[PDB]
Amino acid sequence: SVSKANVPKIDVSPLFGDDQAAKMRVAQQIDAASRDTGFFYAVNHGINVQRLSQKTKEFHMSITPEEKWDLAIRAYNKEHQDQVRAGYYLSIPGKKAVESFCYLNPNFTPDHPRIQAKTPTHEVNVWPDETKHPGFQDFAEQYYWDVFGLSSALLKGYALALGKEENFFARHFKPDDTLASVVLIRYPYLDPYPEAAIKTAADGTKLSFEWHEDVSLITVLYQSNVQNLQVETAAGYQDIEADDTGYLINCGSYMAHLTNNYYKAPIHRVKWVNAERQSLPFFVNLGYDSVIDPFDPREPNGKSDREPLSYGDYLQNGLVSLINKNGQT
Numbered sequence: 001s002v003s004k005a006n007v008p009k010i011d012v013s014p015l016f017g018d019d020q021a022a023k024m025r026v027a028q029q030i031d032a033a034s035r036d037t038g039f040f041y042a043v044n045h046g047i048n049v050q051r052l053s054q055k056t057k058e059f060h061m062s063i064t065p066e067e068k069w070d071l072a073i074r075a076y077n078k079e080h081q082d083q084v085r086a087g088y089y090l091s092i093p094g095k096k097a098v099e100s101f102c103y104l105n106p107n108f109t110p111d112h113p114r115i116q117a118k119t120p121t122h123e124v125n126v127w128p129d130e131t132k133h134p135g136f137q138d139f140a141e142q143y144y145w146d147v148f149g150l151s152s153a154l155l156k157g158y159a160l161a162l163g164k165e166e167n168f169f170a171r172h173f174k175p176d177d178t179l180a181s182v183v184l185i186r187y188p189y190l191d192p193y194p195e196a197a198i199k200t201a202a203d204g205t206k207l208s209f210e211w212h213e214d215v216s217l218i219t220v221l222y223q224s225n226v227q228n229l230q231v232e233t234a235a236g237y238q239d240i241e242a243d244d245t246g247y248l249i250n251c252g253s254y255m256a257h258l259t260n261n262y263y264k265a266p267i268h269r270v271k272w273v274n275a276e277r278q279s280l281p282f283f284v285n286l287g288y289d290s291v292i293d294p295f296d297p298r299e300p301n302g303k304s305d306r307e308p309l310s311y312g313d314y315l316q317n318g319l320v321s322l323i324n325k326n327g328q329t
């Protein structure tokens with residue numbers, strides 16, 4: 001038997017309030033989760049998640065081939081040399097099932113200082129035609145700030161969990177410079193389902209996406225109700241159960257690094273399932289020059305010998321490595 005992962009449901013609503021003790025009781029749950037399998041579900045979170053899977057379907061269903069080339073990232077369209085991160089990631093019928101749309105900080109405009117300096121990892125979002133996709137851009141931009149809001153709360157929790165003041169992470173997570181991204185991913189139902197789009201793990205499990213750690217501080221994910229994720233433990237992979245009312249939370253490799261691996265970046269993978277579904281991650285990245293001084297919660301003096309890492313450099317290296325390891329998405 002494949003076993004099932006312990007993924008506690010955590011009411012995060014106090015992290016939005018001023019009851020300091022209640023916040024500590026949340027911090028404690030985040031602590032325990034982070035030291036166990038690495039994942040928890042954030043519940044009672046305040047986001048209208050019914051209004052987000054709805055909009056995402058429509059978009060992926062009604063967007064045409066013409067429009068997808070017009071929006072395509074550099075990997076699909078050589079005319080779009082500036083689109084490395086933001087835009088459309090096409091499927092390849094017969095070969096690749098998955099398709100997606102990535103967007104960045106909406107404050108990234110032509111006269112944003114980092115765009116004018118052409119700093120790596122910063123791009124101006126591309127959007128579909130407003131008449132073919134009415135209200136889509138307004139929706140997506142508002143969603144970014146809703147999820148931004150939630151993540152800030154979560155960070156206050158991770159800060160207190162590690163014995164820090166509640167702004168230790170959050171002070172670096174700002175609307176004006178955050179490198180955070182949203183990805184709207186469609187996993188289609190297909191019949192017949194293409195063999196090239198299915199990978200076989202060392203243990204025989206059929207996968208849509210291979211094992212990895214996330215390139216992030218934390219990952220804040222909504223998914224529709226189809227079980228697919230697995231987390232690696234010493235006893236092997238365990239199933240993460242679906243919950244399409246909550247957010248699935250985990251640490252990325254920036255956290256592992258900062259905490260001297262006290263809070264690991266859990267290794268996980270995506271099982272193949274032939275079912276129509278949505279996966280909407282928000283990757284919680286800091287600013288290009290944000291630096292957190294590493295530390296070691298296991299040591300009485302808290303000291304770590306690890307070098308401080310600037311976030312933009314970590315992010316560039318990480319995104320290139322993911323593609324070289326798990327493929328162009």
Ligand SMILES: C=C(S)[C@H](NC(=O)CCC[C@H](N)C(=O)O)C(=O)O[C@@H](C(=O)O)[C@H](C)CO
Pocket residue numbers: 084085086102180181183185209212213214215268269270279281283319322329
């Ligand atoms: C390694 C991960 S978490 C994948 N992420 C990327 O490929 C990075 C996207 C970065 C974005 N283009 C940007 O520029 O920020 C990803 O989102 O896939 C999710 C999924 O397959 O549902 C995931 C694998 C579930 O674990």
Ligand SMILES: [Fe+2]
Pocket residue numbers: 212213214268
């Ligand atoms: Fe991941």
